[PDB]
Amino acid sequence: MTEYKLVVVGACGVGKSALTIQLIQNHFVDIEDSYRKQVVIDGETSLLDILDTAGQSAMRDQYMRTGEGFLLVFAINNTKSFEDIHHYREQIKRVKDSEDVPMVLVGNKSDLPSRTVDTKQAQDLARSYGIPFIETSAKTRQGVDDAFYTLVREIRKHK
Ligand SMILES: Nc1nc2c(ncn2[C@@H]2O[C@H](COP(=O)(O)OP(=O)(O)O)[C@@H](O)[C@H]2O)c(=O)[nH]1
């Protein structure tokens, strides 16, 4: 059976944990740093081993090296978190020592009316990196499966 090591990166408070909890435990409440569950994606059974991190040591650099795919998460009501995305992508590329690393850009908190990051901005950035962009809400579950499953699919095309 296939195991996919995924890493969810992004600034503090963007909803990395909420997204992962929603995926794995199917709920949202307004504490675990890692998660593990077997799911079926496009008919293939996959064990997802997922780490949520903001980069703020030995475990971290380790999980980056072996992480096979990365969700780059920002919140649509957090301009700084969007600006931080470049730093996260560059850091990953450095540690992987590679230019073809599976990634997906995730704009979370899409249910909220406060928006300071335009969808156009995010789409343009994703196009530049050559990766998918998915709008999500850990609260409503919008895009949650799609974000993670799309990443798994990026990992497959990569191999
Ligand atoms: N409204 C809304 N709140 C969210 C969403 N995702 C996370 N949150 C809230 O944002 C806060 C920080 O989320 P958290 O998962 O701890 O962020 P993390 O530091 O990236 O893991 C918490 O109060 C969450 O309930 C979302 O999609 N919508």
Side-chain angles (χ1 to χ4, degrees), residues 1-2 4-28 32 34-55 58 61-96 98 100-159:
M1 177 189 61
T2 312
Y4 296 103
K5 297 192 68 181
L6 313 177
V7 177
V8 183
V9 303
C12 184
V14 301
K16 301 179 297 295
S17 289
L19 280 170
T20 312
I21 292 166
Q22 184 53 274
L23 177 76
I24 305 298
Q25 302 178 350
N26 305 305
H27 65 97
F28 173 95
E32 303 163 289
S34 82
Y35 298 86
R36 197 172 163 88
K37 182 177 186 168
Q38 287 169 295
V39 292
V40 190
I41 299 168
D42 307 329
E44 173 187 71
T45 300
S46 330
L47 193 147
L48 306 182
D49 192 291
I50 310 172
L51 178 82
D52 298 321
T53 44
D61 226 317
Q62 276 193 20
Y63 282 115
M64 302 267 279
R65 282 195 286 269
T66 53
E68 293 177 286
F70 298 85
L71 292 187
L72 310 175
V73 189
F74 72 95
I76 63 149
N77 67 332
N78 189 336
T79 289
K80 179 132 198 307
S81 77
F82 179 69
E83 296 169 346
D84 288 341
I85 288 294
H86 187 74
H87 166 263
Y88 289 117
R89 178 176 166 265
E90 290 302 312
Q91 179 177 94
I92 292 165
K93 286 162 54 190
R94 175 173 60 76
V95 297
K96 304 295 284 167
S98 178
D100 185 35
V101 178
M103 301 187 195
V104 173
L105 183 64
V106 177
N108 192 45
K109 306 195 179 180
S110 295
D111 54 293
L112 286 180
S114 308
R115 175 185 283 277
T116 58
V117 182
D118 300 332
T119 292
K120 160 71 160 164
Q121 278 176 273
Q123 286 169 186
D124 286 351
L125 181 61
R127 185 177 315 106
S128 285
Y129 295 158
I131 66 182
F133 168 62
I134 294 170
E135 308 176 55
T136 66
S137 171
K139 177 169 180 184
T140 66
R141 216 186 161 80
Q142 169 185 340
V144 177
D145 286 345
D146 196 23
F148 286 96
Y149 289 12
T150 295
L151 181 56
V152 168
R153 295 169 188 133
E154 287 294 305
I155 295 163
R156 292 166 171 169
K157 287 192 290 185
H158 179 63
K159 303 192 295 176

